[PDB]
Write a protein that binds this ligand. Structure first.
Ligand code: BCL
Ligand code: BCL
Ligand code: BCL
Ligand code: BCL
Ligand code: BCL
Ligand code: BCL
Ligand code: BCL
Ligand code: BCL
Ligand code: BCL
Ligand code: SF4
Ligand code: SF4
Lengths: 100, 110, 364, 359, 360
């Protein structure tokens, strides 16, 4: 179980690259697993996996913010973004360079 | 009859760190050359509750890749972005496997 | 002294629990651990196969099968789920209506299919069935008329559909070269190595229809699967389909895990067609289909191995074993266990693809 | 225990005036057979008598008495065969099958035109020993089968109905033609058989009632691995035949093992590879591959010996792995390398064993 | 005396940087008899590639097959210019000479190979990180000219003229002629299906010193994914990666006692970026594996194999399957164990993968 795949992640960690908001919304939002060999698209089957809990997609910070107000605009702590508006999504924070 | 000659001796970059995932162990600091000093501790609160994390100064950090190639991160916060944009928690993650156990009926493990 | 050293080892266990009376039901539990490397170009391949089946109302038949394949290959997750009602219209024809879905990694597509399979032996001679006790080889041919409809919700489906529409009209050799596409891997080799021949498909006209639940590509095509005689899908049409034996639901939870150091196979199953009645009041475990053996022969001859194989036929109290060649090693009052010696030789024979017989005849 | 195959081989050669040879082979292997029907006890007797060598017509009598799954089936053929030309052969004969209780007679008149794809003197001059010679064989066979049994009549009616419909019947008769893995053996041996051409399916009056007339043609392939096209003149030593030649080969196969007994006195065992050298006939490759597909199925240790008795005054000069023992006039191949070659050919190896003997 | 063992040494010296440009040194010896009715069978093959012009993209390849079989010497030399016009269509212009015994014929050829994959789905390439089984079709169109300077050669051309003009089934039997012997089996064991050819032209124009027979013909190779030529067409031709004249010598000698093989040479394309930042030593082409298994199944053998992958400094192997036994801090060594089982696997025709992933 844990030894299969990356041992840190309970669910498959799918980071979201900065594919965004450059051509009719850029529906081909780039989802990349922790393995990183493949580069998938956000098809409804990936959403089925994500709601199944087997995978979990995460937004990074140090990049052009990915449709940050067009995907979802809940900004209570700036990290309340959800895809199907009832997702309970989690954002990865990186104040890498802006902090001392 | 005739054959040709043979010889055969065989026989006889822009690395980032996710502070949400980072736990503040600082092996990146040990893996960084002292002349650069890219890895640095940032303190948030009580040390025993996670407290300080680590950060990279992008301008100072110039494509050494020692941190990630060392593969010393326990938390997987040390990430590498690629020119095409893929992100790597680890250099080589083990493959995901469909796990289900084996029990022979007549063997002693049944 | 001995030759062919440095052999690997395969440890295998099998159990066939038969059911007494007119019920030909069996419970097959098999385990295998092989230390030989697999023949997978994408080696880390683990597949779990859940084949459920349920008796729908037998007024018209239409037993319902439900197959779920989940395969992780090179850390690529694939899942195929098919639920289909299948019914033997007559002894030669079969008609099915079903739905299903594939899902590889990210791309998934659902299909709704109907299918008329007309299976005809190249000959039905009274003399043959009069003279032979059990014809294992039987020449014949299947004709599948398959109408499959797929909503083109994904853009990949749309591009592929446009490509296929252009191809079927631009090239008449498509009907041939589609066979080249039809075998994804070494299946083209296994086709001729298994005795199967596949005729050029005859398209009846694939067309798109505007569906409220997404546009649907509806493709109707017929293809002919001829058999040299080794093919279970043709020669054993009477079998392969528990038309009246499904008085109870049945299941299979098979699976394997294959990686650079080994293969791990676990099969649990309940099958209604394990036992076949024979002449003289004898009943036997069904003759092994030869397509499995031959198709396994391609990969079974890649390493030299020694097999430690056990098999337990839990025979019903009302039956006594007969005509067992190889013979049984351990004799219980009702159970019968084959292991070692000649049976081990047979296991090594069929692991490499040898189509040999393991006649086990049980009777009252 | 362990699968160990013991094979005792011996060949005795006449020389000078004859290319004849007497062969005895006793094989016993513990591996199970690859027959879906387990017990198979078959005996084969082939007797070729020179009816007339001047005419070229030699009479081959072939009886195959087999017991498979407690079913006794006996095939028999008698055929006068003659080379009309070096490319075309003509056969006229009669036979019958005796499968179980069913039995049917057939009278066959056939012509086989074995044409080479290419015949180049450049190829003939260099690379002298021709093995992979490709060619096409056009077989045209007319079969007369008396329709007596009502099941037989039903079969005849079924086939004449199947030829009325089923425009692709010629291609699918190939799938019917080969009961089991023989369709795979087509490709394994390299032969590709084309769609047959049925010149005529008809009935004809006769003393035994109607006789089904079946004239049909087909084409045996041209890879070159198959030896029917590569050695067209070698397989048929009509000129070298002057006495009856007899081969009795029988195998008894139980799940416990296979026991083979072969006793064959035949012409054509010695062929002159070059000037002053006589060679044992080169191994046909189609049997090697067709039996290798079966022999690959089980690991085995090998105990093999080969005894060669030459014509008096001849000695072995060149040899694939040399003879293990040599008595005067007797050579014995055994030990390591010969066992390696035997294990090679059991599993389908087409490697050579070039035994050259000279006066 | 009864033991048959295979002794093999392998050395893969990769070079630093994005370009692989690796050197392969392989020695092999096996006591099993060869699967060749003509023995002894000796062969020397020299393949040297030279960058003719980087701006034009033209590369030049010379292959010299020298062989001795049954005390007969055959030599196929061929110099060719390969040029990638498009990612599907590729052109070739070359000249060569086949000398068998006293006979010798020179040939020239213009040739276009158009390789088209059946499925160009973005879904498959998006999901599968390592595409192995890629179906497709290669259309070859070859115009080959040979001086008819020999009477036997003239006879061959004349007989072929009549053969083409007489039989309409010639396009099927020409495959039997071309696939001489076990080759016709191998194409079925490797997923290769060959369509009937089409003879566009068959004519003769005469040069002042002798006649020239010109034959233009097309054929269609068809790969069911297992074929290296189709599935790895891009990995086939690393012309962009080639700036230095690369070359490989390969000689195998086959007496009935044993087979001895030596393959020494450098060439690009050994390692490709598999994604995820790890360079992968290229996947094994499966056609060699199955075609060699065809003859390797014929006998059993003990395995004594040793592979020595020489990484360039600064790079480490992150994945090996099976694992490396020993490491010299730059050289990773696979000797015995599951690597021996994998060597047995591939010798007998196994298509199992050996994932060598290495990175900075
Ligand atoms: C060295 C010899 C070894 C050995 C070495 C190997 C090697 C080497 C390989 C295997 C492989 C396998 N072996 Mg093994 N194996 C040994 C002995 C065993 C034993 C045992 C001890 O009893 C068992 C239980 C097995 C069992 C298995 C399987 C787990 C596996 C093949 C899966 C298969 O069925 O796919 C079924 C596949 C298909 C049906 C093909 C699908 C593709 C084609 C294009 C489509 C076909 C038609 C389609 C399905 C029709 C659908 C529609 C119809 C309506 C139904 N082997 C011996 C001792 N084994 C192989 C494996 O899978 O590796 C990962 C493999 O590579
Ligand atoms: C595999 C060898 C033959 C073959 C032989 C058969 C046979 C035999 C049958 C069909 C049937 C069907 N075939 Mg088919 N068919 C093949 C190739 C194909 C291909 C293709 C690969 O392109 C397609 C699209 C089809 C299409 C179809 C459908 C029209 C139809 C119903 C499918 C369905 O219910 O599956 C559902 C999917 C499965 C259940 C997946 C698993 C398949 C395996 C083979 C089942 C093994 C059973 C196991 C040993 C015992 C299970 C016990 C459990 C308790 C259930 N065939 C090849 C040529 N085909 C059926 C029919 O006639 O319908 C009218 C039928 O009876
Ligand atoms: C669409 C496919 C076809 C079909 C194709 C075949 C073929 C072909 C064969 C059978 C065989 C059998 N099938 Mg069926 N069969 C169909 C319909 C059915 C139904 C049903 C009412 O739906 C049932 C319950 C059965 C039940 C059975 C048994 C009578 C018999 C196996 C007995 C044995 O001991 O198995 C014990 C077997 C197991 C322990 C192994 C099971 C292995 C795996 C799980 C299934 C086989 C396929 C392949 C290896 C794996 C998946 C590959 C792809 C992902 C599809 N069939 C459908 C319509 N079936 C086999 C038999 O022996 O025929 C005489 C056989 O070869
Ligand atoms: C594991 C390795 C084992 C081994 C494994 C096996 C196995 C396993 C089997 C055999 C089988 C056989 N083996 Mg063995 N065998 C070993 C060692 C040997 C040795 C030896 C070293 O001395 C010998 C001589 C043999 C010899 C034999 C044969 C007696 C037998 C196959 C009969 C045959 O000719 O059918 C030839 C039959 C054909 C030609 C039939 C063709 C059918 C088709 C449909 C008809 C097409 C048309 C027809 C050809 C046309 C002819 C036209 C006329 C020319 C006019 N084995 C090694 C050590 N062997 C088989 C056996 O005995 O079966 C019961 C078998 O399954
Ligand atoms: C085997 C490869 C080829 C083949 C190659 C040849 C060759 C070569 C010859 C024929 C010949 C004949 N072929 Mg044919 N033929 C094949 C398959 C067929 C089939 C079929 C059902 O597939 C048919 C209908 C025929 C029809 C016929 C007949 C018209 C004719 C005489 C047969 C005979 O007397 O057999 C009787 C059968 C027996 C004697 C048993 C034969 C066993 C083996 C194959 C040969 C004997 C040698 C044996 C190894 C050692 C014994 C030595 C003894 C002294 C004989 N062939 C396949 C496709 N055929 C002959 C001819 O040209 O006729 C005009 C001929 O010379
Ligand atoms: C081998 C499997 C396929 C095949 C696949 C390919 C591939 C792959 C290529 C060609 C190409 C060519 N093909 Mg082709 N082709 C085959 C059969 C044929 C036949 C025939 C009747 O047998 C003919 C006439 C041709 C004709 C031709 C030419 C038009 C052209 C250049 C040949 C040349 O320079 O060779 C010179 C001779 C050789 C170099 C001899 C050795 C060949 C082997 C295959 C090389 C392997 C290299 C080794 C693994 C690594 C070497 C490192 C070295 C440093 C280079 N092909 C079969 C069916 N064909 C090329 C092209 O597209 O041209 C436009 C090309 O890329
Ligand atoms: C239907 C099953 C297969 C498939 C089977 C075939 C076959 C078979 C052939 C083509 C052929 C062609 N197909 Mg296609 N094709 C597929 C999906 C695609 C996709 C895609 C989006 O992935 C594309 C871009 C294409 C496009 C094309 C061209 C590459 C090629 C020539 C076009 C022409 O004849 O018209 N197909 C699907 C997945 N395609 C033809 C060609 O010549 O192939 C080389 C051809 O005969
Ligand atoms: C032991 C072998 C491994 C394995 C090893 C490999 C290897 C190695 C390769 C692939 C490749 C592929 N495999 Mg895989 N893969 C396995 C299991 C699966 C399963 C699954 C059971 O869930 C699926 C869906 C797939 C799917 C795929 C694709 C991602 C890809 C081929 C693309 C293509 O052109 O296909 C087209 C395929 C078809 C034309 C064949 C026909 C499809 C099926 C059989 C049709 C019948 C379906 C159904 C049962 C019928 C009834 C319903 C009908 C609607 C009537 N694999 C098993 C476990 N796979 C290749 C790759 O990625 O290529 C880039 C590759 O190199
Ligand atoms: C005319 C031939 C074709 C062609 C056909 C093929 C085929 C087919 C294959 C390769 C393969 C390879 N080729 Mg190439 N290739 C062509 C052009 C080139 C050029 C170039 C710029 O000219 C270069 C540098 C290469 C380089 C390469 C490598 C990237 C790769 C082998 C990797 C390895 O480690 O091999 C290890 C090295 C070897 C084992 C050395 C082999 C040396 C011998 C002398 C050549 C092979 C002989 C073969 C077995 C028999 C041929 C007999 C025929 C009758 C001619 N190719 C030309 C245009 N090449 C393989 C690969 O993986 O492709 C992706 C592959 O499958
Ligand atoms: S990449 Fe180099 S500079 Fe940047 S943190 Fe690592 S060691 Fe320091
Ligand atoms: S190694 Fe990982 S946990 Fe430790 S300081 Fe670096 S990023 Fe944080």
């Amino acid at each position: 179980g844990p030894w299969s795949g990356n041992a840190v992640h309970k669910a498959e960690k799918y980071f979201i690259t900065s594919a965004k908001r450059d051509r009719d919304g850029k529906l081909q939002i780039e989802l990349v697993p922790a393995s990183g060999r493949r580069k998938l698209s956000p098809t409804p089957e990936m959403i089925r996996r994500l709601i199944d809990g087997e995978i979990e997609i995460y937004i990074l910070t140090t990049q052009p913010d990915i449709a940050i107000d067009m995907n979802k605009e809940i900004i209570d702590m700036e990290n309340r973004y959800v895809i199907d508006f009832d997702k309970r999504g989690v954002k990865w924070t990186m104040r890498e360079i802006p902090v001392f | 009859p005739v054959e040709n000659k043979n010889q055969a001796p065989a026989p006889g970059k822009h690395y980032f760190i996710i502070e949400n995932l980072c736990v503040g162990c600082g092996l990146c600091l040990d893996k960084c050359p002292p002349k650069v000093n890219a890895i640095g501790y940032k303190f948030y609160g009580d040390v025993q509750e996670g407290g300080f994390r680590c950060y990279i100064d992008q301008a100072a950090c110039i494509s050494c890749s020692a941190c990630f190639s060392g593969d010393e991160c326990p938390s997987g916060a040390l990430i590498e972005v690629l020119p095409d944009g893929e992100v790597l928690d680890f250099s080589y993650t083990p493959p995901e496997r469909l796990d289900f156990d084996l029990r022979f009926l007549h063997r002693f493990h049944r | 002294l001995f030759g062919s050293n440095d052999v690997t080892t395969a440890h295998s266990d099998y159990e066939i629990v038969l059911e007494g009376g007119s019920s030909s039901w069996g419970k097959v539990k098999a385990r295998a651990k092989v230390n030989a490397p697999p023949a997978s170009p994408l080696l880390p391949a683990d597949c779990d196969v859940k084949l459920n089946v349920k008796p729908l109302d037998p007024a018209k038949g239409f037993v319902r099968i439900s197959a779920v394949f989940e395969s992780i290959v090179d850390s690529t997750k694939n899942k195929l789920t098919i639920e289909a009602d299948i019914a033997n219209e007559t002894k030669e024809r079969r008609i099915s209506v079903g739905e299903g879905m594939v899902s590889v990694g990210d791309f998934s597509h659902t299909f709704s299919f109907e299918g008329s399979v007309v299976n005809l032996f190249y000959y039905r001679s009274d003399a043959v069935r009069r003279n032979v006790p059990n014809p294992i080889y039987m020449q014949g041919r299947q004709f599948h008329d398959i109408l499959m409809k797929v909503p083109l919700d994904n853009n990949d489906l749309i591009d592929t559909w446009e490509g296929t529409v252009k191809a079927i009209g631009s090239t008449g050799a498509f009907n041939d070269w589609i066979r080249d596409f039809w075998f994804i891997g070494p299946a083209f080799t296994a086709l001729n190595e298994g005795g199967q021949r596949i005729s050029r498909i005859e398209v009846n006209g694939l067309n798109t229809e505007s569906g409220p639940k997404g546009p649907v590509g509806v493709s109707r095509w017929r293809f002919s699967h001829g058999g040299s005689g080794m093919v279970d899908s043709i020669s054993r049409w009477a079998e392969l389909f528990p038309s009246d034996k499904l008085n109870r639901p049945a299941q299979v939870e098979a699976g394997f895990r294959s990686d650079s150091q080994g293969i791990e196979v676990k099969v649990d199953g309940e099958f209604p067609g394990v036992s076949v009645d024979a002449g003289g009041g004898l009943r036997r475990i069904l003759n092994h289909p030869l397509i499995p053996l031959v198709h396994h022969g391609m990969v079974g001859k890649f390493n030299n191995f020694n097999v430690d194989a056990q098999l337990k036929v839990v025979l019903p109290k009302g039956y006594k074993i007969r005509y067992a060649a190889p013979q049984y090693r351990s004799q219980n009052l009702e159970e019968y266990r084959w292991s070692g010696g000649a049976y081990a030789r047979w296991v090594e024979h069929v692991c490499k693809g040898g189509v040999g017989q393991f006649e086990i005849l049980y009777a009252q």
